[PDB]
A paper describes a structure:
The electron densities corresponding to residues 148–173 and 555–567 were invisible, likely owing to the structural disorder. The first disordered region contains a 19-residue insertion at SS-A. The asymmetric unit of the apo-NLGN3 crystal contains two NLGN3 molecules, which form a dimer. The molar mass of the recombinant mouse NLGN3 ECD determined by size-exclusion chromatography coupled with multiangle light scattering (SEC-MALS) analysis is 160 kDa, which corresponds to the mouse NLGN3 ECD dimer. All reported NLGN dimer structures, including our NLGN3 structure, exhibit a similar dimerization interface, where two helices from each protomer form a four-helix bundle. The C-terminal tail of NLGN3 ECD is disordered in the apo-NLGN3 ECD structure, suggesting that it undergoes a disorder-to-order transition upon binding to PTPδ. Arg448 in mouse NLGN3, equivalent to Arg451 in human NLGN3, is located in the helix next to the dimer interface. The side chain of Arg448 faces the protein core and forms a stacking interaction with Trp495. The R/C mutation seems to affect this local structure in close proximity to the dimer interface. Structurally, the R/C mutation may affect the stability and dimeric assembly of NLGN3.
The X-linked neuroligin 3 (NLGN3) gene encodes the postsynaptic adhesion molecule NLGN3, which interacts with presynaptic neurexins (NRXNs) to organize synaptogenesis. Here, we identified a non-canonical synapse-organizing interaction between NLGN3 and PTPδ splice variants lacking the meB peptide, which competed with NRXNs by steric hindrance. To elucidate the structural mechanism of the NLGN3–PTPδ-meB(–) interaction, we determined the crystal structures of mouse apo-NLGN3 ECD (residues 35–684) at 2.76 Å resolution and NLGN3 ECD in complex with PTPδA3B– Ig1–Fn1 at 3.85 Å resolution.
Residue numbers in the entry:
A (entry chain A): 38 to 147, 174 to 554, 568 to 610
B (entry chain B): 38 to 147, 175 to 554, 568 to 610
Write the structure that this text describes.
Amino acid sequence: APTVNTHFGKLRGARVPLPSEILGPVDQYLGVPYAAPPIGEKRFLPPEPPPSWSGIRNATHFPPVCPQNIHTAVPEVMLPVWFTANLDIVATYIQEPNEDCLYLNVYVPTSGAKPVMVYIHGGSYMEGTGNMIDGSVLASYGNVIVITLNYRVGVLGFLSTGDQAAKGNYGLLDQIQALRWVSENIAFFGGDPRRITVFGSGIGASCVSLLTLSHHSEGLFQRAIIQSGSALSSWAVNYQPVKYTSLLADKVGCNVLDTVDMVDCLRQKSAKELVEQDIQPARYHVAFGPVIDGDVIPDDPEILMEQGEFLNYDIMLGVNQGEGLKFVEGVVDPEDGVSGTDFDYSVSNFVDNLYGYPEGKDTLRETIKFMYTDWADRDNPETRRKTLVALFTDHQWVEPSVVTADLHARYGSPTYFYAFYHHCQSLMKPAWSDAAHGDEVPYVFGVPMVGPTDLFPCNFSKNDVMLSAVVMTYWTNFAKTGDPNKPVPQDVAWSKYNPRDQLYLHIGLKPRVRDHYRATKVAFWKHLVPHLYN
Amino acid sequence: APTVNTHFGKLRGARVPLPSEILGPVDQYLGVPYAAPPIGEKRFLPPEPPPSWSGIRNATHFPPVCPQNIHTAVPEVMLPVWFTANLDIVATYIQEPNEDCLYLNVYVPTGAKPVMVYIHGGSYMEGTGNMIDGSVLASYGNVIVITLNYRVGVLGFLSTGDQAAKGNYGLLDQIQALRWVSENIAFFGGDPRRITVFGSGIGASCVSLLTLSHHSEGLFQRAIIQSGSALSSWAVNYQPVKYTSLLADKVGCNVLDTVDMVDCLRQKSAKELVEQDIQPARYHVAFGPVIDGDVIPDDPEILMEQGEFLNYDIMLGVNQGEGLKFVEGVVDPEDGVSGTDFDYSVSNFVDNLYGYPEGKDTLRETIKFMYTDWADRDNPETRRKTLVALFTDHQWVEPSVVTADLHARYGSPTYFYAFYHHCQSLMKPAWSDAAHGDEVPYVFGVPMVGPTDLFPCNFSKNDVMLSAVVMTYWTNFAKTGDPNKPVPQDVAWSKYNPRDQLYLHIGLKPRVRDHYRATKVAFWKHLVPHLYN
Ligand SMILES: *[C@@H]1O[C@H](CO)[C@@H](O)[C@H](O)[C@H]1NC(C)=O
Ligand SMILES: *[C@@H]1O[C@H](CO)[C@@H](O)[C@H](O)[C@H]1NC(C)=O
Ligand SMILES: *[C@@H]1O[C@H](CO)[C@@H](O)[C@H](O)[C@H]1NC(C)=O
Ligand SMILES: *[C@@H]1O[C@H](CO)[C@@H](O)[C@H](O)[C@H]1NC(C)=O
């Protein structure tokens, strides 16, 4: 009977033994309320502290997830491969969602106060839950506390009228609120409030990125790990909340004169209704997500990076070899190639969606075509496919991540960069593909140590286990000391990243330090492309 | 007393033994007239057959070279490094030039032998085949080597853009010299059926043009085009009318009627026409080959598409650092180039070649980007290398590749190379790679004789070994049209085609590679035309 005392009352967790003998068991406390339920008047309002309970509270079972619908259309590209490939298994987690969903899960190892790693999940700002990820392995192996949380998503989480009626960013405020709770209470679990690291993958990483740039998050956590995401990608921030919110208002018939009144009208509607609505944004953009409210996000995220807000965090970030898999998947023939006409089509469509037919568009389009053509093997259809993925991977992930890594390490503050060049073999993904979006997740959470799971049907080798131990060792070490190499040595040194040297860690079965990761491509998007048009 | 009978008379050459003991002696016949003197009425007229001579002609000494002046300004970048670095020694060859200068030199080893006809070239204004001694190439490769003299500068390429002066007289001289060889080299033990013509620099620009001419038909079978093309900005003069009239004004021979001004120009001393300081636009030529519609029927690129030169076996290539003189002015004592200096030269380059058209600003930044090493942005030494490469790629590599592509289009025999070696000397900065003309000494086997007045290089044993290799490749091509047959190296030089793009990397360790600087070549060929109108 594992019990822990907190500022709001006592709660009872469970001791669960890992299938692996070598790994020790963990005490896990599921469904701990970190805020008062955001329902009724509380909807579209910042989170409030949870009420206290007089007795011992049961933390044995998973709570309801936040209102969401996987069947309803959402941007496919934004979601991790493991997610879309296994929608059936995911559905078992999402069933019976409730607006009362602000809960978190805690995984504690069985010397001294332990570091705390707070994970932020994320599919597309519309879906997902921390429940899918079981932090037991990461906790027991690295001897740290692992936390997975649930936050308001979609309409309920990010609705904004662009004024005082609905400022937005409620999903982010929940994360802040969840972080305060950990800061004030994790000491009760044997956790160190002074050593708190927050990390996420994909959209989760975009959230982590934004948390580092916020005044509200100041003092709560010390380090961040930003995996395959940034505050700078086209779908990280919604620059038209007013447009998409009114579209919602019309669909539910909540159209009225005063924005204050229409928000109130939205409060009356069932939580289910607001979610189901088919509100599609412009391609590679988001209809409901973080906005620049002037409070939580005081300015354009890039400007905030220049101002130096997030320099007081130790930061580790990186990308995968083939993130943008879904960008070309539609157009790949059975021979695993892409035709020249198809290449020209995708490149042009890419320029259409991202740059929107500006002056000199014809000039840029040809320039993009040139940079991502392998002139040493012009005709090869397979290589044509690789470059096409690379085009999307570089633009949406690599360049924004690198710009972030540069701006953070500008004054020597601790920064680490990586490129993930390995992935499990599975039927979830075409055999010709490299490490795709989210493919780093299983190794971070030590899935090969437990073997194949319902969510990761991968056929893990001994090599997979070996790398997973390595990745976790790097990851937990960073949490403990802000240095990937200390204190637990590998049984290669991960060098610090600075704008001049540009050293990064190539993570694969063959690990090594390298420099200037795709710098020529990164330079193209950062420097040359802004010049070509206007 | 080495004597040979010809269609124009008997002539006696001299037999000279090579300093290398391994190499056998050669019979050399110097100053053989291949055309009637182009003087008086003959000036600015196509070459005519040489008159016969009744006695035995002495061919032991060099004849006068064509009218030229090395002191008078000519574009420095166009000239080979060995030439400009040793103007003093060059001057001894150029002394006493005479308008009666259409002579050639023959080098014969002691069955019928292949004939290699070399065409020299600095800038169309100067030079002579006399400077190059084909004895080594002849004795080692067992082939006949021929170096010729042709009309240069005003006398060689003056054009009024009409019938008064069609131009291309320098090329016509080369054609005429080739006819002479075709009809008479059999008397020397040569095979008229196996004739290869080759040249370096502007000389290579000529060979390229000869292959595209109707006039050259039937004369020669193979060509070796070294560090030159018919497509470079300075290969063809597209404003002959403009520069010719400038000359007329300076000599005071300017008139409305073209026939009369040409006639007046005939009156002037050969001396007067040469000395004149007439500078063309940068990287362009004031006097050179023109598109007359006869010798050069159309734009050289168009002629390539039409397929004129497909019936020739062709071998061509470039050097690693051709464009040395493009950046030499701007190199600091640290052997580096500053960013401001980098931006300056790149901007000036776009100014000269593209002439400030619309979207020049967009193009300028794109050039800057492509030739910046973003993996070592700050390095001043690397900035220097890229600056050399920019000029090297644009002026030599890309035009050469385009030529090689168009020739091998239907599978006709083509071979490509990149020369990645050079001798150590004071002629050239120590940091430099193989520069313009640096392949010449190895082609002509200079290391076999050791350092000469024209090539003060300190040749190592490695230099000798490579020179043997290069000559073996070269002479093999002359004999069979294949670099590998019949004499084996004791590496196989693969044929070049547009898809595979295989080339021979020539250095102390020769090897086959593919798609030589293809990304850079593709930039100049495909992307750059798009940016500006
Ligand atoms: C918690 O669950 C246990 C059974 O697992 C039950 O005995 C206990 O009464 C529950 N506590 C509360 C407060 O409901
Ligand atoms: C899973 O492993 C088995 C061997 O145990 C193999 O037959 C199968 O191909 C593997 N699956 C994938 C997707 O590689
Ligand atoms: C032939 O010419 C050479 C020039 O090198 C001269 O020295 C020689 O005396 C001449 N011989 C005769 C027989 O005229
Ligand atoms: C002369 O040769 C030596 C090596 O034998 C070399 O180090 C030196 O640079 C050479 N000097 C010149 C002027 O070629």
